[PDB]
């Protein structure tokens, strides 16, 4: 496994450690993101290893800034690193330009840390989704271990992703409400999760277009979503 150095291309023009880091993101818990004109929604399977875990502590959704959230899949500890950098970058942007960082600019600056490997032994085994609201309204991007951001309208990452890109293709239209989005989110998780979907087993957040602020759904408010289905 040290036969091929880490900067090596395969015969198909893929860097091997990147392709492998991607393979690690398919072992991760499913996360997903849905752009709506009313806001963005992120939702994550928590996938806790025990009832004895305190579920707030296994937080797959993270405030980057008042208006940006991220949700990881793959190696959580690797994700903590990226999100720390995003936080720092988003805040340096406020500092320097006295305004909130755009969501894309933020995703860029999080990919700017993922290029660095030869410095970092290996790539981050992490894909983020980064939802936010700025001047161009709600937005959802995906980072990969490649370092390649990609704006999306709906996305999944994780073991779910393939089954969840089935469901988006059928039920996602560019014009849904924030509640129809919450609903499609939680639906998808119900369908792809291993465990029974309960209000502690998942994590849901939204960044609303109107206020441009990010709300993390408490278990209560996630029941309020499960209610109508």
């Amino acid at each position: 496994e040290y036969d091929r150095g880490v900067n090596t291309f395969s015969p198909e023009g893929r860097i091997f450690q990147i392709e492998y880091a991607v393979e690690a993101i398919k072992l991760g818990s499913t996360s997903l993101g849905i752009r709506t004109p009313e806001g963005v929604v992120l939702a994550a399977e928590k996938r806790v290893p025990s009832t004895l875990v305190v579920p707030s502590s296994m937080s797959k959704i993270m405030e980057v800034d008042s208006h940006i959230a991220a949700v990881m899949s793959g190696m959580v500890a690797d994700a903590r690193i990226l999100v720390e950098h995003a936080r720092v970058e988003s805040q340096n942007h406020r500092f320097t330009y006295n305004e909130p960082m755009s969501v894309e600019s933020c995703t860029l600056a999080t990919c700017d840390l993922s290029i660095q490997f030869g410095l970092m032994s290996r790539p981050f085994g992490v894909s983020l989704l980064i939802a936010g609201v700025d001047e161009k309204g709600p937005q959802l991007w995906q980072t990969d271990p490649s370092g390649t951001h990609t704006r999306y309208d709906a996305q999944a990452i994780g073991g779910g992703a393939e089954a969840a890109q089935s469901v988006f293709t059928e039920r996602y239209h560019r014009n849904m409400t924030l509640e129809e989005g919450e609903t499609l989110a939680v639906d998808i998780l119900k369908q792809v999760m291993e465990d029974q979907l309960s209000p502690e087993n998942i994590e849901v957040a939204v960044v609303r277009a109107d206020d441009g602020k990010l709300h993390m759904y408490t278990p209560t408010e996630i029941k309020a979503i499960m209610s109508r289905m």
Binding site: A21, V54, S56, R80
Partner: protein, 234 residues
Amino acid sequence: SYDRAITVFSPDGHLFQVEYAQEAVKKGLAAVGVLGSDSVVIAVEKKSAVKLQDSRTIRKIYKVDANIYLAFAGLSADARVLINKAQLECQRFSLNYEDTMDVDMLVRYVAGVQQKSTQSGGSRPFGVATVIGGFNEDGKPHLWKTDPSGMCSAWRAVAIGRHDQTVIEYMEKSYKDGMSRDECVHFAIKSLLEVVESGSRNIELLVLQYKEARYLTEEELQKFVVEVEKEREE
């Protein structure tokens, strides 16, 4: 400087060096943490008690700051390094922010050092899991775990080391919220004895209450081992 890449993804997404660090933690002595209403209980297996080791008390639960305590499983010497770093971090923090470090802050620092070592060229991962327990300066008790991937997580109770998952499966069944000090110590002793042989000289046990950390004397412990081994017949 030597900066070869030690930790790298293999084909099926895995980081072997981190899986193998974790294998080194499954060979380590058990440790267990339990969170009650007003207490955290950290209990660890000792290796035995050969007549040769110093009869002067050596603790296998380490103090990181006044308020924070850490058990570990895995490579002793790696652990010792992590702990020294943790100790030194808590002081750096006091010194920068006057306040004392919240436990969760300390845990995150440690987990970040663990993570950092799965991604630094030249270095292998620490082969150490930790249980960390303590109280913030607001009377709220916490209990955390780190594994060698650098992942931490808060628990109501937890086990690390050999047969961690046997012990955690046990604890899922029994464990209730809002235990007393004495029910915590009981529950921890009970849980450890799922994998440790006697409860004689091979269990150190630490009890953390807001502002007061106290190891059981070998005598106080044995009233609890009889009270428990007598409850295991049934």
